[PDB]
PDB file of C-alpha atoms in Angstrom:
ATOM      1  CA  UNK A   1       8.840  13.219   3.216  1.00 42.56           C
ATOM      2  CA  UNK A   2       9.868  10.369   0.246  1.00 40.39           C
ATOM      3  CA  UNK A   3       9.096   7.444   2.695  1.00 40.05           C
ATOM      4  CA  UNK A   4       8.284   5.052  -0.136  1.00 40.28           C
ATOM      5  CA  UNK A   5      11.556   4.626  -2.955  1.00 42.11           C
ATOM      6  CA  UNK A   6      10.369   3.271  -6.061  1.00 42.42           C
ATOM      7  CA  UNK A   7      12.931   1.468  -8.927  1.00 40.80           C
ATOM      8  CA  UNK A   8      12.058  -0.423 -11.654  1.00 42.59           C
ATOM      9  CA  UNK A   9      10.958   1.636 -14.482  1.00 42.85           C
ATOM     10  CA  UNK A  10      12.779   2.051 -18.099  1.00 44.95           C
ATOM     11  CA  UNK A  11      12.042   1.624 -21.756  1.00 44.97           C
ATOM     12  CA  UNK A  12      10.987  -1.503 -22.735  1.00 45.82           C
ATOM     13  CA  UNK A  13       9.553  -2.277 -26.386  1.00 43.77           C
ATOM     14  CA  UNK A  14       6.050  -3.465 -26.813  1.00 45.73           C
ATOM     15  CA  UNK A  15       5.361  -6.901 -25.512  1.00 45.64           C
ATOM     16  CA  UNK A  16       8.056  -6.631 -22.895  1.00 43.92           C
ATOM     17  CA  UNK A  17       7.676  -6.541 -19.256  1.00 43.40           C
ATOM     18  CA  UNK A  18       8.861  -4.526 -16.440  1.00 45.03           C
ATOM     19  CA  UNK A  19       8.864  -5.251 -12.645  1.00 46.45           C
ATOM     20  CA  UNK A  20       8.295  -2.346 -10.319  1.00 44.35           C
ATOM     21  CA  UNK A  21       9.785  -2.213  -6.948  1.00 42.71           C
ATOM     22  CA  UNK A  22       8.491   0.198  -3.868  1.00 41.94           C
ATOM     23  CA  UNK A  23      10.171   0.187  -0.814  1.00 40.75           C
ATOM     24  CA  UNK A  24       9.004   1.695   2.647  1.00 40.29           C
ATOM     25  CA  UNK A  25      11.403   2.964   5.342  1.00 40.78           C
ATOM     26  CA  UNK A  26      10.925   2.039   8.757  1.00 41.07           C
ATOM     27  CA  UNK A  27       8.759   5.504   9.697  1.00 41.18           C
ATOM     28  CA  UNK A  28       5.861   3.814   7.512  1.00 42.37           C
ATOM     29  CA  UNK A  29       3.527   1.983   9.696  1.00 41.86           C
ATOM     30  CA  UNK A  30      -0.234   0.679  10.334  1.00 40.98           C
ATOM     31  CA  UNK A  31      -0.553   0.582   6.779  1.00 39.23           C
ATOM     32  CA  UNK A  32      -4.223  -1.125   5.981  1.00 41.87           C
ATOM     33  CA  UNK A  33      -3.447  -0.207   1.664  1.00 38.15           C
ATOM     34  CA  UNK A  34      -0.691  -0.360  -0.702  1.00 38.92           C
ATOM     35  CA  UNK A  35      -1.954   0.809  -4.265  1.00 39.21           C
ATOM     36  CA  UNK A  36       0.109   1.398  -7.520  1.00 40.23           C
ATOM     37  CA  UNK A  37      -1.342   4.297  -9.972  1.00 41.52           C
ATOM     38  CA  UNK A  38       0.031   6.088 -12.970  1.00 41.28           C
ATOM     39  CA  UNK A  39      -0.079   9.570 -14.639  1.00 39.60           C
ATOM     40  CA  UNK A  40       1.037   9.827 -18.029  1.00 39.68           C
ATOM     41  CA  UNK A  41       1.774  14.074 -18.913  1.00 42.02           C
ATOM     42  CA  UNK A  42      -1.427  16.438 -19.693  1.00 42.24           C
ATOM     43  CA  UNK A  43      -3.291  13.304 -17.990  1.00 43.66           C
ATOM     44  CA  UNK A  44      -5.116  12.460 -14.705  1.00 40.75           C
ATOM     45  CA  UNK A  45      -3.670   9.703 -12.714  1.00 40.54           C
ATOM     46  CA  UNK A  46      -5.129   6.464 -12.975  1.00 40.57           C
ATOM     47  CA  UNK A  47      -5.322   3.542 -10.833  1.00 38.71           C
ATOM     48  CA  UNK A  48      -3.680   0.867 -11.892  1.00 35.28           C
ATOM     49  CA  UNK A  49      -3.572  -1.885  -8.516  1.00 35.46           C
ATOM     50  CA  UNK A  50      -4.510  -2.646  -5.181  1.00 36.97           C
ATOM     51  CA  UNK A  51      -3.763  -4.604  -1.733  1.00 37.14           C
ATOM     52  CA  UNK A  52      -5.687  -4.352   1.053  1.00 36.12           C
ATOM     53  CA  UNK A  53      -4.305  -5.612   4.437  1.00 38.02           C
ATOM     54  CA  UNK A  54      -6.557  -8.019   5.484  1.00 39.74           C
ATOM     55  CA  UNK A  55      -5.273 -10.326   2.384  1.00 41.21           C
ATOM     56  CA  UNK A  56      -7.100  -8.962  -0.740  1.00 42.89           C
ATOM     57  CA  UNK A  57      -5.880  -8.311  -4.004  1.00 43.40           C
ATOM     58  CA  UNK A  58      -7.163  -6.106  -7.173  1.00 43.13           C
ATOM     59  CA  UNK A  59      -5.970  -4.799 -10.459  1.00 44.72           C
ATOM     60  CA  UNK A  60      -8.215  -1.981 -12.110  1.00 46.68           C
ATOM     61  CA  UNK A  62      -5.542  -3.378 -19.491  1.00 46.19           C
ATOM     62  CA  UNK A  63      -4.433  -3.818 -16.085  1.00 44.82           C
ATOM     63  CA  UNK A  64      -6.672  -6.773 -15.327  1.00 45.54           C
ATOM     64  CA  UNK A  65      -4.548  -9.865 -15.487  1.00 49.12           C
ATOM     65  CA  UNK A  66      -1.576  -7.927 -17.348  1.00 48.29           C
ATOM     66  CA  UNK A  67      -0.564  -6.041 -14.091  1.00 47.45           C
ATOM     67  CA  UNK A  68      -0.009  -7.848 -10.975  1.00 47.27           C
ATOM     68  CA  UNK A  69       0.356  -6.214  -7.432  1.00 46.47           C
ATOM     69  CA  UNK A  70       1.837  -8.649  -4.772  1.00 49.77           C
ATOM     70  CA  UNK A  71       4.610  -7.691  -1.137  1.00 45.84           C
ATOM     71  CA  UNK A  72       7.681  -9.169   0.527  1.00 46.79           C
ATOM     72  CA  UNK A  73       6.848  -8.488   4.322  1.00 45.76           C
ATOM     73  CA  UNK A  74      10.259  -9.699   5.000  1.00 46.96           C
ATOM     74  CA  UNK A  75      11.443  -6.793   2.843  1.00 48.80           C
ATOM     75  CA  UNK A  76       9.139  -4.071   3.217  1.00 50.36           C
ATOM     76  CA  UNK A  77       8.171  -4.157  -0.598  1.00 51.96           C
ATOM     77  CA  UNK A  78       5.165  -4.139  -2.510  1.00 55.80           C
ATOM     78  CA  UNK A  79       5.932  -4.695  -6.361  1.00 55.32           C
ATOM     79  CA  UNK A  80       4.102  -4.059  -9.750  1.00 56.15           C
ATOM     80  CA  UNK A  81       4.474  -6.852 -12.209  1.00 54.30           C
ATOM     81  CA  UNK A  82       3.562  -5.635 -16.271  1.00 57.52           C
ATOM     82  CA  UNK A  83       3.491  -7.745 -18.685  1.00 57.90           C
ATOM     83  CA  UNK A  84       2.501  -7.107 -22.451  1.00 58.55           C
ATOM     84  CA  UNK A  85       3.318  -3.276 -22.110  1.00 54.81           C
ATOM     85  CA  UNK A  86       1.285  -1.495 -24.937  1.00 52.11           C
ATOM     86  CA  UNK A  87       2.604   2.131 -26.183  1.00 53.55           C
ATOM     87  CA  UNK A  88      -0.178   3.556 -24.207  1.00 55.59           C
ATOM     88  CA  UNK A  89       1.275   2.502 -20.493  1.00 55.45           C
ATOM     89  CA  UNK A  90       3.614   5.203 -21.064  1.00 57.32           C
ATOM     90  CA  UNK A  91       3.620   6.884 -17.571  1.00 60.12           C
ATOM     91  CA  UNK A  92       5.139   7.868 -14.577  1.00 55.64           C
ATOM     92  CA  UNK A  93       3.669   5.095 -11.946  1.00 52.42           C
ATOM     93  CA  UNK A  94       3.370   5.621  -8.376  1.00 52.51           C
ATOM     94  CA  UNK A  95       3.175   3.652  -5.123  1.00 51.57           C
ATOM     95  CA  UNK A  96       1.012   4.267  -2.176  1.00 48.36           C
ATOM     96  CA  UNK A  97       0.493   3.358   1.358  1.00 49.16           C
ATOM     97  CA  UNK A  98      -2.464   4.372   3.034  1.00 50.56           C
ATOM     98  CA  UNK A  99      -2.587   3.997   7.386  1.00 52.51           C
ATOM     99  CA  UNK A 100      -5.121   4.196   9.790  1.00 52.50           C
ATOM    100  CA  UNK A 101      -3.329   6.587  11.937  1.00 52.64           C
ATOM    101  CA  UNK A 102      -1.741  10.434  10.942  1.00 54.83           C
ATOM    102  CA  UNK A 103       0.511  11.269   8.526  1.00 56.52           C
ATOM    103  CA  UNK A 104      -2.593   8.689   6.942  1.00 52.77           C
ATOM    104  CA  UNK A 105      -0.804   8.594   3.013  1.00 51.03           C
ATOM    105  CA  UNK A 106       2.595   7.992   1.844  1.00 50.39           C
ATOM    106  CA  UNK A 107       3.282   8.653  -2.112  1.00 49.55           C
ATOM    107  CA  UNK A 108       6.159   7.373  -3.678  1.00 47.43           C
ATOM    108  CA  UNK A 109       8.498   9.677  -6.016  1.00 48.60           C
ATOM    109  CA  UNK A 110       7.802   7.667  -9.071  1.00 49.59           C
ATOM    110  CA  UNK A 111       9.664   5.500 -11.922  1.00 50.90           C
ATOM    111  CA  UNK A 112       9.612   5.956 -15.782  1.00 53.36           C
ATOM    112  CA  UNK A 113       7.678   3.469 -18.096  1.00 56.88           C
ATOM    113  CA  UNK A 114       8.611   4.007 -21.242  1.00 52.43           C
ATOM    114  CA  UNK A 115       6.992   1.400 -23.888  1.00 54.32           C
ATOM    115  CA  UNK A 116       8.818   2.366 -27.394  1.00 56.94           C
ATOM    116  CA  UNK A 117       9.865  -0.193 -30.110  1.00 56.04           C
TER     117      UNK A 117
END
């Protein structure tokens, strides 16, 4: 089911930023990944960020302009974007990948609308 509730999203004009929020009920566990990806309509999704639990962080202009980072305490990973650019358009999506079955957990997605 939704185990993963994103907020966050809205439209922003260009050169404004937006922070992303994804939080994870209590049924998620074991959880060695936490990604963020996107999918703008008639497109494929894309990846946009990653953490991988062992400390590691990556960000597939999304290098340097978005920023992945959690709050243990809170059971949140976040998606900072700065600069947005018309094209970032999309509907972006968390993700939580565990070592042990139901194995992936998508989030149900929030709007980023970049329109001046």
């Amino acid at each position: 089911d939704v185990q993963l509730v994103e907020s966050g999203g809205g439209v922003v004009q260009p050169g404004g930023s937006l922070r992303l929020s994804c939080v994870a009920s209590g049924y998620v566990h074991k959880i060695n990944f936490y990604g963020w990806y996107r999918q703008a309509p008639g497109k494929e999704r894309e990846k946009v960020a990653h953490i991988s639990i062992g400390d590691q962080t990556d960000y597939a202009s999304a290098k340097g302009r978005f920023t992945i980072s959690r709050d243990e305490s809170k059971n949140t990973v976040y998606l900072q974007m700065n600069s947005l650019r018309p094209e970032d358009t999309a509907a972006y999506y968390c993700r939580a990948l565990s070592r042990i079955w139901p194995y992936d957990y998508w989030g149900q997605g929030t709007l980023v609308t970049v329109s001046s």
